[PDB]
Write a protein that binds this ligand. Structure first.
Ligand SMILES: [Mg+2]
Ligand SMILES: [Mg+2]
Ligand SMILES: [Mg+2]
Ligand SMILES: [Mg+2]
Ligand SMILES: [Mg+2]
Ligand SMILES: [Mg+2]
Ligand SMILES: [Mg+2]
Ligand SMILES: [Mg+2]
Ligand SMILES: [Mg+2]
Ligand SMILES: [Mg+2]
Ligand SMILES: [Mg+2]
Ligand SMILES: [Mg+2]
Ligand SMILES: [Mg+2]
Ligand SMILES: [Mg+2]
Ligand SMILES: [Mg+2]
Ligand SMILES: [Mg+2]
Ligand SMILES: [Mg+2]
Ligand SMILES: [Zn+2]
Lengths: 78, 48, 162, 137, 119
RNA sequence: UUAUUGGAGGUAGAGCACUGUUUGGACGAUUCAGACAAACUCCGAAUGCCAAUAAUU
RNA sequence: CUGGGGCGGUCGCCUCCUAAAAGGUAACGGAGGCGCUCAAAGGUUCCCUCAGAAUGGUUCAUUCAUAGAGUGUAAAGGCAUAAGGGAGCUUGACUGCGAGACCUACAAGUCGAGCAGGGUCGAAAGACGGACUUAGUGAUCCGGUGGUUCCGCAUG
RNA sequence: CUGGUGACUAUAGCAAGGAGGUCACACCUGUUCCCAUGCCGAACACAGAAGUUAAGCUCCUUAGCGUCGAUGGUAGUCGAACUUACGUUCCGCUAGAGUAGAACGUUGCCAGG
């Protein structure tokens, strides 16, 4: 006969876009995601589609928050 | 929702503000205050 | 009310002695009741239920709605405390309960200190003498006492025909 | 036994058969067991035939535990069809058996009777087996 | 069986909700209120370094006369403004401590706002 | 390219805490014991990947 | 397109698995969904907390109950800062933009601090350029309509 | 020592027992005012102080549940050699489960005493 399957959507290239310890400029996307898999930390914003972005120039730090949650911050380079 | 609408100002001849509504839900001409560039203030834009 | 006075003076010492306590706060002090007038009717009927409940309590009731259809007002209840609590309990025990049958049960404890006593017809209470039909309007008393047996003495001290 | 009453997905990737037995490597309900020393799929028909052999020889009286269940469905295409055009339909149900897995356990009969019954059952199975007792120090 | 709520725990959960998006800096410190059945306490805090740069209260002997708790809250607000002006504090953010902005907390805030502070 | 350091992520394995599947007891759904899973996870590697500042290139 | 072709099925978009712990990754591989909807189901401030079980009553009450409920809709990822529930006011479901970044053959698509103009809600800090997030769409040419300090074939 | 307010992956929580209220916190007594319940001063808010530790709350002793958790070994696996065996061998890395064990919180300021 025939298959009823065969469909899929375009992959959305989610995940980390900058490395921990890397210097980024303001507006740089740090993380693409659905929901808050990683939370916005210090000097980091959360866009309408849950994109995390740096609000300042600085160094990216991925850190833990609480017991089972994560966050990413950006800190001004001294 | 159901149909596109255009809201018109009482001074501006522009119809910049298009939006939608449900005809069964809101059969009456909907109106709301919107910012008007040519007057530089909020005025009353009403459905055409 | 006189019931509050008798609780403060009469029932307090007798209850303290019967169930030995070290302080008067361990003494049972019935928290409240709930005049739940449930009307399982779709529609007209709920207005009569609201009017009857407002008659037998003196305060407006809250129209309750189902949780599963949804948003249809099903139940109705009124909450009383303090003076309204004691006055209504006195009226229900001295007039309404003898006007129906002989009295409330002695096994209908929720297992914790809550005594569910559900009147079988709206004609028992001394109001709305006139009249639509009987209604399963349940009166559930809540109390501070942690045990079920620490509450029969309190209801009897207020005059419950156990 | 025979088969699950229901499964979420009736068309499943076939299980991996390399490696050793993950669990169920000890006699835990009875006195004696049949331990697999060789890897294979085991079908529900093979299980049922082995069970009938063992319980018939034991003449009831004893207790029989079947430790493996055919959770996995497998599919088969119709006879004489070209490749492609989707996956086939469920043909049967199988369990994966790797060395060390106890297949059957028995209790309530003598050691000699258990040995004979388990040998008879093992001749119905697609794996090499060894008679094992309940493990102590 | 009627267990009773603990008001402090409920208001503390409300305080956590309030403080998720409210913190004191050096330029803008957080003015925090703690309220009891009798006394109202205030503190001015820098959240980044976890330090307190001012403190006034209703139980302090400076203003503990016979007055309403709202008047005492007003006195606490004025005193906190005094301490803030004695430490160079100019503009702040008010943390209502999870309580409603009404009554004693609101009077403390009005007194602080009407005696020098900026929030 | 390597060393070191930091990080993102859920595969192998394992496990049954959730979803589903399953065996034998016990008590009157819960409980004891024991299993199964690409679209299960209380867990979780090796590697690979992204970077930061020394050696070789 | 096609394990020859035909017949059957399919053709764009969204979600999951296959996918080998970044991203990406095929088959007429395994499963589903979309071509909307909502004047609140948007914004803001304040408040609130579920499903279920047991036990009592001719819907109510108590007790547990980390969520086993709900989240307009398929799935996944999130959510008790609630993103879930209610109420008051309201229209930011704004105008001009936009450092930088993601994605990417192109055309497209995505996120965005922040600046200015005028507001809404809030005591205030502040939040708001629609909706928990990710589908709900179609280029150019041509034509219709509205506006327009533009052009308009000697000049008006 | 108590309280206010932060920080930290519950080693911090739950559970069971006991000890205390001088101030403090709380329960509590009320509803005139501000405010308030789809109903109720239960809550929110406001006056307070009759009283009470009874509960919350502090303090103490328990590892009962929960949480944390080695070493040793096993699985898996980067690389290499052999090999086609539902594989073997060497090397590095090294789980999960379980075991001993940790744990009935540590600490920054501010104030009181
Ligand atoms: Mg995809
Ligand atoms: Mg959006
Ligand atoms: Mg096991
Ligand atoms: Mg596996
Ligand atoms: Mg089972
Ligand atoms: Mg099984
Ligand atoms: Mg898995
Ligand atoms: Mg063909
Ligand atoms: Mg065709
Ligand atoms: Mg990979
Ligand atoms: Mg990937
Ligand atoms: Mg489809
Ligand atoms: Mg369609
Ligand atoms: Mg909500
Ligand atoms: Mg919203
Ligand atoms: Mg001409
Ligand atoms: Mg001309
Ligand atoms: Zn206009």
């Amino acid at each position: 006969s025939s298959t009823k399957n065969g469909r899929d959507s375009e992959s959305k290239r989610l995940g980390a876009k900058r490395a921990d310890g890397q210097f980024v400029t303001g507006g740089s996307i740090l993380y693409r995601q659905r929901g808050t898999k990683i939370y916005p930390g210090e000097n980091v914003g959360r866009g309408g589609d849950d994109t995390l972005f740096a609000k300042i120039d600085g160094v990216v730090k991925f850190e833990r928050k609480g017991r089972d949650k994560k966050q990413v911050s950006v800190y001004a380079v001294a | 929702v159901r149909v596109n609408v255009t809201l018109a100002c009482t001074e501006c001849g522009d119809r910049n503000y298009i939006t939608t509504k449900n005809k069964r839900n809101n059969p009456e001409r909907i109106e709301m205050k919107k910012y008007c560039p040519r007057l530089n203030k909020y005025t009353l834009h009403r459905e055409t | 009310n006189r019931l509050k006075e008798k609780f403060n003076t009469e029932v307090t010492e007798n209850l303290m002695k019967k169930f030995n306590y070290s302080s008067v706060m361990e003494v049972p002090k019935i928290d409240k009741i709930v005049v739940n007038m449930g009307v399982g009717d779709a529609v007209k009927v709920l207005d009569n239920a609201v009017e009857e409940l407002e008659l037998i309590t003196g305060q407006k009731p809250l129209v309750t709605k189902a949780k599963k259809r949804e948003g249809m007002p099903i139940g109705a209840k009124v909450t009383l405390r303090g003076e309204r609590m004691y006055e209504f309990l006195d009226k229900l025990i001295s007039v309404s309960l003898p006007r129906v049958r002989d009295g409330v049960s002695k096994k209908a404890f929720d297992g914790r200190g809550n005594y569910t006593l559900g009147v079988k017809e709206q004609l028992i209470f001394p109001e709305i003498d006139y009249v639509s039909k009987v209604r399963g309007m349940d009166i559930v008393i809540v109390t501070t006492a942690n045990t079920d047996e620490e509450a029969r003495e309190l209801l009897a001290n207020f005059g419950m025909p156990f | 036994m025979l088969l699950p009453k229901r499964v979420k997905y009736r068309r499943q990737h076939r299980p991996k058969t390399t490696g050793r037995s993950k669990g169920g490597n000890y006699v835990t309900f009875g006195e004696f067991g049949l331990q697999a020393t060789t890897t294979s799929w085991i079908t529900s028909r093979q299980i049922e035939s082995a069970r009938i052999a063992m319980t018939r020889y034991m003449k009831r009286g004893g207790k029989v535990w079947i430790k493996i269940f055919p959770h996995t469905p497998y599919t088969k295409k119709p006879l004489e069809v070209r490749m492609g055009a989707g996956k086939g339909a469920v043909e049967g149900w199988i369990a994966v058996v790797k060395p060390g897995r106890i297949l059957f356990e028995v209790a309530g009969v003598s050691e000699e009777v258990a040995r004979e019954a388990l040998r008879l059952a093992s001749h119905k199975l697609p794996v090499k087996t060894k008679f094992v007792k309940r493990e102590e120090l | 069986m009627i267990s009773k709520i603990d008001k402090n725990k409920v208001r503390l959960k409300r305080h956590a909700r309030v403080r998720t998006n409210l913190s004191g800096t050096a330029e803008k410190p957080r003015l925090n209120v703690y309220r009891s059945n009798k006394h109202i306490y205030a503190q001015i805090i820098d959240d980044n370094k976890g330090v307190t740069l001012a403190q006034a209260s209703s139980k302090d002997s400076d203003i503990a006369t016979t007055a309403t708790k709202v008047e005492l809250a007003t006195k606490v607000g004025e005193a906190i403004a005094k301490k803030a002006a004695d430490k160079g504090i100019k503009e702040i953010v008010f943390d209502r401590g999870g309580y409603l902005y009404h009554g004693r907390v609101k009077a403390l805030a009005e007194a602080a706002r009407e005696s020098g502070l900026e929030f």
